[PDB]
Design an enzyme around this catalytic site. Sequence first.
Site, PDB file in Angstrom:
ATOM      1  N   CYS A 107       0.650  -1.207  -0.152  1.00 41.25           N
ATOM      2  CA  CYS A 107      -0.157  -0.060  -0.010  1.00 41.25           C
ATOM      3  C   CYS A 107       0.796   1.357  -0.193  1.00 41.25           C
ATOM      4  O   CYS A 107       1.424   1.539   0.867  1.00 41.25           O
ATOM      5  CB  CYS A 107      -1.012   0.126   1.019  1.00 41.25           C
ATOM      6  SG  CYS A 107      -2.003   1.543   1.044  1.00 41.25           S
ATOM      7  N   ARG A 110      -0.307   4.800   2.438  1.00 37.01           N
ATOM      8  CA  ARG A 110      -0.281   4.541   4.157  1.00 37.01           C
ATOM      9  C   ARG A 110       0.035   5.688   4.914  1.00 37.01           C
ATOM     10  O   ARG A 110       0.051   5.806   6.208  1.00 37.01           O
ATOM     11  CB  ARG A 110       0.681   3.356   4.610  1.00 37.01           C
ATOM     12  CG  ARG A 110       0.288   2.196   4.112  1.00 37.01           C
ATOM     13  CD  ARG A 110       1.239   0.965   4.593  1.00 37.01           C
ATOM     14  NE  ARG A 110       2.143   0.764   3.431  1.00 37.01           N
ATOM     15  CZ  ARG A 110       3.447   0.081   3.681  1.00 37.01           C
ATOM     16  NH1 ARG A 110       3.610  -0.383   4.807  1.00 37.01           N
ATOM     17  NH2 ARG A 110       4.172  -0.087   2.621  1.00 37.01           N
ATOM     18  N   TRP A 279      -9.378   5.705  -1.531  1.00 39.92           N
ATOM     19  CA  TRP A 279      -9.764   6.405  -2.792  1.00 39.92           C
ATOM     20  C   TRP A 279      -8.549   5.884  -3.957  1.00 39.92           C
ATOM     21  O   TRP A 279      -7.679   5.281  -3.267  1.00 39.92           O
ATOM     22  CB  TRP A 279      -9.719   8.080  -2.670  1.00 39.92           C
ATOM     23  CG  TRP A 279      -8.451   8.781  -2.099  1.00 39.92           C
ATOM     24  CD1 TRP A 279      -7.304   9.090  -2.517  1.00 39.92           C
ATOM     25  CD2 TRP A 279      -8.467   9.107  -0.670  1.00 39.92           C
ATOM     26  NE1 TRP A 279      -6.589   9.626  -1.655  1.00 39.92           N
ATOM     27  CE2 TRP A 279      -7.053   9.492  -0.498  1.00 39.92           C
ATOM     28  CE3 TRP A 279      -9.239   9.107   0.260  1.00 39.92           C
ATOM     29  CZ2 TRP A 279      -6.820  10.320   0.623  1.00 39.92           C
ATOM     30  CZ3 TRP A 279      -8.963   9.833   1.580  1.00 39.92           C
ATOM     31  CH2 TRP A 279      -7.505  10.272   1.709  1.00 39.92           C
ATOM     32  N   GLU A 284      -4.106   3.179 -11.407  1.00 39.60           N
ATOM     33  CA  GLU A 284      -4.971   2.140 -11.007  1.00 39.60           C
ATOM     34  C   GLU A 284      -6.085   2.111 -12.322  1.00 39.60           C
ATOM     35  O   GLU A 284      -6.119   0.881 -12.730  1.00 39.60           O
ATOM     36  CB  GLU A 284      -5.421   2.078  -9.986  1.00 39.60           C
ATOM     37  CG  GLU A 284      -4.522   2.227  -8.556  1.00 39.60           C
ATOM     38  CD  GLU A 284      -5.175   2.123  -7.345  1.00 39.60           C
ATOM     39  OE1 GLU A 284      -6.069   0.881  -7.026  1.00 39.60           O
ATOM     40  OE2 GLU A 284      -5.453   3.035  -6.564  1.00 39.60           O
TER      41      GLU A 284
END
Lengths: 403, 404
Positions: A107, A110, A279, A284
């Site tokens: 991730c 973070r 979000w 992506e």
Amino acid sequence: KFPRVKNWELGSITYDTLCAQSQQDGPCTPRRCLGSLVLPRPAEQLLSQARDFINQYYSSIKRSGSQAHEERLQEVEAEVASTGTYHLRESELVFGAKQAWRNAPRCVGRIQWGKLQVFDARDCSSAQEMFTYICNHIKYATNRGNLRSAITVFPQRAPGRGDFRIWNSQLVRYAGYRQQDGSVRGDPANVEITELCIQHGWTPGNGRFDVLPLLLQAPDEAPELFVLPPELVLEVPLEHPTLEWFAALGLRWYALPAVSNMLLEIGGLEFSAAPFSGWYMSTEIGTRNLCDPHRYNILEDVAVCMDLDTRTTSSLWKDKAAVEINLAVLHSFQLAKVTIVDHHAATVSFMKHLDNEQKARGGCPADWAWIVPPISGSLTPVFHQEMVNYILSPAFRYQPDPW
Amino acid sequence: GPKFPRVKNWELGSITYDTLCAQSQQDGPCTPRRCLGSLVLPPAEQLLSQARDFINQYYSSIKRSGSQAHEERLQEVEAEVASTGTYHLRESELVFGAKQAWRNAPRCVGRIQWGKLQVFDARDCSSAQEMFTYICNHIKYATNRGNLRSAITVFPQRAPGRGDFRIWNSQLVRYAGYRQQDGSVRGDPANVEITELCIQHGWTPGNGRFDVLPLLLQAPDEAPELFVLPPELVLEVPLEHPTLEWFAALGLRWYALPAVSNMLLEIGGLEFSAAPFSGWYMSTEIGTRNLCDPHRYNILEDVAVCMDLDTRTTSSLWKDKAAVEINLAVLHSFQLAKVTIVDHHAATVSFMKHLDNEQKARGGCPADWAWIVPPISGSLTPVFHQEMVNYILSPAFRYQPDPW
Ligand code: HEM
Ligand code: HEM
Ligand SMILES: N=C(Nc1cccc(COC[C@@H](CN)OCc2cccc(/N=C(/N)c3cccs3)c2)c1)c1cccs1
Ligand SMILES: N=C(Nc1cccc(COC[C@@H](CN)OCc2cccc(/N=C(\N)c3cccs3)c2)c1)c1cccs1
Ligand SMILES: C[C@H](O)[C@H](O)[C@H]1CNc2nc(N)[nH]c(=O)c2N1
Ligand SMILES: C[C@H](O)[C@H](O)[C@H]1CNc2nc(N)[nH]c(=O)c2N1
Ligand SMILES: [Zn+2]
């Protein structure tokens, strides 16, 4: 030997001492590194994970060694010895869910880890009730485009019975309809879940962006189908700031990324249904979801529209089209007032995060292949940053598909 | 399932198992507790076993394993090590070993070419002057007026006691990096240390952004000596863009021949400390890393400003747009100049082919995903979607400490 971690752009060095806290093996051995693989290749056990987690909690609130601490360890112990399991207090659950996010090596977002709305849905007893909680989560997280990170935690796995599961991989997924000639209409990633839905009685559409119903499953019961009310699913039509024809492509994406197939593990307890949302980072959608050859695969269409020479790799037509598509996503989200973050801003905030975590914990688990964005890798500071990947608990993990 | 790493391609859905990793005699930096894959830099009877293994690999490659020729070579190697503490390679063993080291290199995306390598045997070299002659010949052969040919030149191996042959420079062609009064750098900041070493050793420094460095060559137990490459041996490509006419005005350029000169070539436990090798560039090495890294020429903002982009906000994607045009300029300019270059799409497609070839030939291929994936447009290339297993096989190219 604790790992030396070098930043190649700045020449700075840190040492990761957090990795000594890791209690679960990854895929790698001295003989070979399996770092790039996507998926993983008794009461005393529970009790030690439980105690460790209880210790993490009381330390986080600066009450280590308090009477409150000693007594909570006794409760956990008493309950495990008697029943083979135990239960978390809501405040522990909240702390655990945030830590699982903090600890997630893949991730990039973070920096936000301390800001997470935790919905306790452990009092859920039916698929009908799961749907109500899921609808409230979506409404809360969506917030008319001003997105707010959230997690909803349904009841933990229990030795006797089947798990609570959301069969869908995300709360919002577009259908993928396999043709008799093998090809796909919609999102090829979702062919299997699409088919499961139809089989469980969903009347399918036939568009490129049909929102799937949810298949929700209470223990040892067949899953149930629930169509999401259209007004709860915010979507963003994609247009380009200067290329007028781009809107003509009829492309869109949903605002809310909400992952619903990962198992949440806190102090040895396992939450098989704990959907979480934040979000999007623009790549992506713009790069992976729209440009992967096994996804919507739109690079050629866009290249042709831009009149690029498609006959040769060395015109860099793919690169030019990908950039414009990412620009379109950012532009269209910004125009719709829907939270999104570009890969430059996201990776810069991750660097700050690495530094916060160095000071706070003496390291940060990070999976380089997943942190570096899928376009413009070396243009972001994370490309030049060595990272150490390892598993801390609380953790989000993969679990088998329930069908 | 098979007891070997399972390797998945997520684009195609296909699975292989790597059985070659079983031949790894040498540990990497990872353990079950933590992965260190992203880190850049993470003998008596010992010689004999490495030697035996290598001779076994040689005889396998010519299909004479267990032959009488094979058993006699083994005996001869042990005899040589018995009486001298070391041994020496036959010409054909050197050639096989140099190709194998390239084939084995996990970070090299160009390995589809591994079988096509010209091996210059320079194991008779006895002075720094002669190393220079060999290097000039290497450059002339490899450059071949722009039709580049892969080559390696192998200088004598490390020998008990005696000092090493070393080329001090990290590549045969490097642009100077001159530290400025204000603290910034003119030229290539990667080369500040080698530039200052050249000056300390008597080179008269220029002051441009693209000054070719002299070579610092060291023969056994001698101070390195300084050699200036004749300018006409060093082919360069001025950079222009196919549509943006102002790009030529930037006065940017790159050299044609990438030739790495500071790695150690290890074959059968023998150590070739000077063994420069060359191929050709993948365009992103120049256009993305060398020109756009913040700690290299760092030209992104200059290019973006010429393109009139919004450099005040990340979300304009100004960096991405400029980097694409810079990469395009590199490709276009090398093409116009007729100098071999490969773009990152064509290179990664060929590497996927290489992976398939090696799966059939050896049951796997050691590959370092972070290094094989190009630095722009990652997921636009097929290698992004391909899982890879990284491990060290020998013969190998390895890092070695700097001679100073
Ligand atoms: C707030 C904004 C956030 C951003 C921009 C973000 C960004 C990302 C991105 C881009 C990925 C890679 C996803 C992919 O390639 O498919 C990811 C992975 C992940 N993030 Fe986030 N994140 C955010 C918040 C969260 C939250 C709230 C959680 C959970 C509480 C979370 C947990 C994860 C996990 C578990 C993964 C890894 C999934 C896997 O291993 O397959 N993140 N993050
Ligand atoms: C034929 C054309 C070739 C191409 C296009 C090519 C491409 C590349 C590229 C792009 C890298 C990464 C370099 C970096 O990021 O700095 C690389 C690494 C490497 N290649 Fe090649 N390669 C070629 C030929 C060769 C040859 C002839 C050899 C040696 C005989 C070689 C051995 C290596 C080694 C050892 C590395 C890794 C360097 C390290 O670990 O630091 N390659 N290759
Ligand atoms: N196309 C090519 N490219 C290429 C192939 C291999 C290598 C290279 C360039 O060298 C890569 C080098 C330079 N970044 O990366 C590894 C490295 C090695 C040694 C030192 C490095 N960095 C440092 N400065 C150090 C820090 C601490 C000690 S040294 C970095 C380029 C070819 C070259 C030869 C045949 S093909
Ligand atoms: N911005 C976000 N993005 C995001 C964050 C985490 C995850 C995701 C999407 O999930 C990534 C998934 C889907 N590509 O990739 C990994 C994966 C997970 C689980 C199973 C996978 N593969 C399979 N299901 C298989 C098919 C055949 C055999 S196995 C592959 C998106 C956020 C989501 C929630 C908060 S932030
Ligand atoms: C094989 C490879 O690990 C796989 O394609 C990974 C690479 N990096 C990734 N990074 C992110 N963020 N998401 C992904 O799905 C992947 N896929
Ligand atoms: C920290 C990280 O490993 C480092 O920046 C690597 C990443 N991948 C790379 N890949 C290649 N081909 N060359 C490099 O120099 C690097 N640098
Ligand atoms: Zn590893």
